[PDB]
Design a protein around this ligand. Sequence first.
Ligand SMILES: *[C@@H]1O[C@H](CO[C@@H]2O[C@@H](C)[C@@H](O)[C@@H](O)[C@@H]2O)[C@@H](O[C@@H]2O[C@H](CO)[C@@H](O[C@@H]3O[C@H](CO[C@H]4O[C@H](CO)[C@@H](O)[C@H](O)[C@@H]4O[C@@H]4O[C@H](CO)[C@@H](O)[C@H](O)[C@H]4NC(C)=O)[C@@H](O)[C@H](O[C@H]4O[C@H](CO)[C@@H](O)[C@H](O)[C@@H]4O[C@@H]4O[C@H](CO)[C@@H](O)[C@H](O)[C@H]4NC(C)=O)[C@@H]3O)[C@H](O)[C@H]2NC(C)=O)[C@H](O)[C@H]1NC(C)=O
Ligand SMILES: *[C@H]1O[C@H](CO[C@@H]2O[C@@H](C)[C@@H](O)[C@@H](O)[C@@H]2O)[C@@H](O[C@@H]2O[C@H](CO)[C@@H](O[C@@H]3O[C@H](CO[C@H]4O[C@H](CO)[C@@H](O)[C@H](O)[C@@H]4O[C@@H]4O[C@H](CO)[C@@H](O)[C@H](O)[C@H]4NC(C)=O)[C@@H](O)[C@H](O[C@H]4O[C@H](CO)[C@@H](O)[C@H](O)[C@@H]4O[C@@H]4O[C@H](CO)[C@@H](O)[C@H](O)[C@H]4NC(C)=O)[C@@H]3O)[C@H](O)[C@H]2NC(C)=O)[C@H](O)[C@H]1NC(C)=O
Lengths: 207, 205
Amino acid sequence: PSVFLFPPKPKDTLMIARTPEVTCVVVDVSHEDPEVKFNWYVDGVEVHNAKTKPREEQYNSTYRVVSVLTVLHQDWLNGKEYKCKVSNKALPAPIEKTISKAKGQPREPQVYTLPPSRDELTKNQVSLTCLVKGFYPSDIAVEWESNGQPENNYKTTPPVLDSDGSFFLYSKLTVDKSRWQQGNVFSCSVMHEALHNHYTQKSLSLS
Amino acid sequence: VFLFPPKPKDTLMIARTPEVTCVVVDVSHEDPEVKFNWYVDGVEVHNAKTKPREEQYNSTYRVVSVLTVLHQDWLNGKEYKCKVSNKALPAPIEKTISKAKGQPREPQVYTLPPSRDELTKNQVSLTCLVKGFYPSDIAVEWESNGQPENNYKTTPPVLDSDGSFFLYSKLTVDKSRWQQGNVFSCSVMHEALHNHYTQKSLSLS
Ligand SMILES: *[C@@H]1O[C@H](CO[C@@H]2O[C@@H](C)[C@@H](O)[C@@H](O)[C@@H]2O)[C@@H](O[C@@H]2O[C@H](CO)[C@@H](O[C@@H]3O[C@H](CO[C@H]4O[C@H](CO)[C@@H](O)[C@H](O)[C@@H]4O[C@@H]4O[C@H](CO)[C@@H](O)[C@H](O)[C@H]4NC(C)=O)[C@@H](O)[C@H](O[C@H]4O[C@H](CO)[C@@H](O)[C@H](O)[C@@H]4O[C@@H]4O[C@H](CO)[C@@H](O)[C@H](O)[C@H]4NC(C)=O)[C@@H]3O)[C@H](O)[C@H]2NC(C)=O)[C@H](O)[C@H]1NC(C)=O
Ligand SMILES: *[C@H]1O[C@H](CO[C@@H]2O[C@@H](C)[C@@H](O)[C@@H](O)[C@@H]2O)[C@@H](O[C@@H]2O[C@H](CO)[C@@H](O[C@@H]3O[C@H](CO[C@H]4O[C@H](CO)[C@@H](O)[C@H](O)[C@@H]4O[C@@H]4O[C@H](CO)[C@@H](O)[C@H](O)[C@H]4NC(C)=O)[C@@H](O)[C@H](O[C@H]4O[C@H](CO)[C@@H](O)[C@H](O)[C@@H]4O[C@@H]4O[C@H](CO)[C@@H](O)[C@H](O)[C@H]4NC(C)=O)[C@@H]3O)[C@H](O)[C@H]2NC(C)=O)[C@H](O)[C@H]1NC(C)=O
């Protein structure tokens, strides 16, 4: 009977309006002994606003019960740690997992937008590039848009540990070749803690 | 028990020696002994290279086999079965591996110069976008003046929306080396590429 612990989504914590939550998934408890008690601890202080939600079978014959705790944006951001104590009877001792933000100096992502190579203009779809380097920690969130409306054909690479201990990532946005050729401005929106207001944005259009 | 593919570069260069490894973490002092029957497309092979058995410290060892595959064999999608007979197990464990099936596609390679906004700095970013390839085994490298570069980092391959993959490679040079006009080059090595190897250049305009 194994147990997992997941951080809040980046976006959740850096937007006061949203609700960040750590999840304590428990895959594999057995029919034999079903019962599970979730004592949540925050910086050690036991919390009681647990949200142990029910309970879902599967196609391997073992359950999966999940808890959820709502963290404060600040609590998480300031590096507090969330302990999940999972008491079952298939185990001699209750399993534990601690999680928290990544320690160390948060650093401001730099954001450069990179136009399509000349060599791609042969095509009828074109690549816009957003290079976001220099950040820490690696929780971050990138999105594309134009004319105030969002874009949906973009994909983003994972954050890569750069040589200086910071992270980079790229975002590629794929538009029709004409939309660029005319002069539409497009924008890359980054959202990261070490950004002023947790959010910057760079633009990009034909010259 | 685990099973690892040859490195991309090994298979796409006739001169190198691609090899699948059958790592076995965790056998116990109690019962040490392990026999490695390798099978290729089912046909049992006997050029096994079971390399020695190194009783690791957590009282669990780790014995490794190695098989040398032919470049062809791998590239044509043959499958490599590893059958690991121990006595802590009732039945011998199995793992099969092979290349990824599916139409290999030629990577397009575009080199992208530094944003204007980075010229404030004293180190500058060169970008190599390599999109459209399949399978995702690929190898990217940077160089200039025929000599190699060493300050570059590369993102994993990302599953693009059309089933193909992209990745980017960032090379970090001093701001002057660019400002002057040094050509730099991104070297990609992938199966669907003619001669398994293309290369694009990049310099100040
Ligand atoms: C007792 O000790 C031994 C070793 O003793 C040591 O004790 C001290 C002294 C220290 O030295 C310690 O280092 C060490 O603990 C322990 O043995 C370890 O056991 C674990 C599992 O029990 C193994 O983990 C696996 O690791 C692989 C990948 O690891 C690569 O990179 C590692 C470096 O971080 C390296 O350790 C590995 O050797 C390996 O490196 C590659 O080597 C090959 C072979 O030559 C080479 O070609 C490559 O060059 C090289 N790689 C490169 C390029 O760098 C990991 O992939 C495994 O994960 C699979 O299984 C997981 C569950 O166990 C699962 O969660 C994962 O999802 C994954 O399953 C797969 O998932 C991927 C998704 O991407 C995908 O393939 C599939 O979806 C799925 N596969 C399928 C379909 O099944 C795995 O975690 C360690 O390798 C091993 N350590 C050693 C020595 O390698 C042992 O743990 C101890 N005893 C106990 C009780 O724990
Ligand atoms: C029978 O069925 C179930 C379910 O079927 C499963 O899913 C279906 C769809 C098929 O693909 C099946 O093949 C597959 O089996 C099986 O249940 C599985 O149980 C295993 C092990 O117990 C789990 O493996 C782990 O995977 C987690 C990752 O889980 C996240 O992502 C998953 C997919 O992305 C998702 O399923 C999870 O819900 C979760 O996703 C997140 O969910 C949260 C909220 O819950 C949400 O906030 C997020 O939005 C969402 N995230 C997103 C976007 O995806 C992973 O944590 C584990 O990896 C660690 O542990 C391994 C130990 O073996 C180790 O080898 C790994 O390398 C890795 O090690 C960790 O490393 C990190 C840093 O590298 C370190 O911090 C940790 O300390 C270290 N942990 C260690 C050492 O323990 C692990 O790989 C499966 O996720 C789980 N499947 C599902 C769907 O839940 C079941 O096993 C089957 N029966 C069998 C075969 O026994």
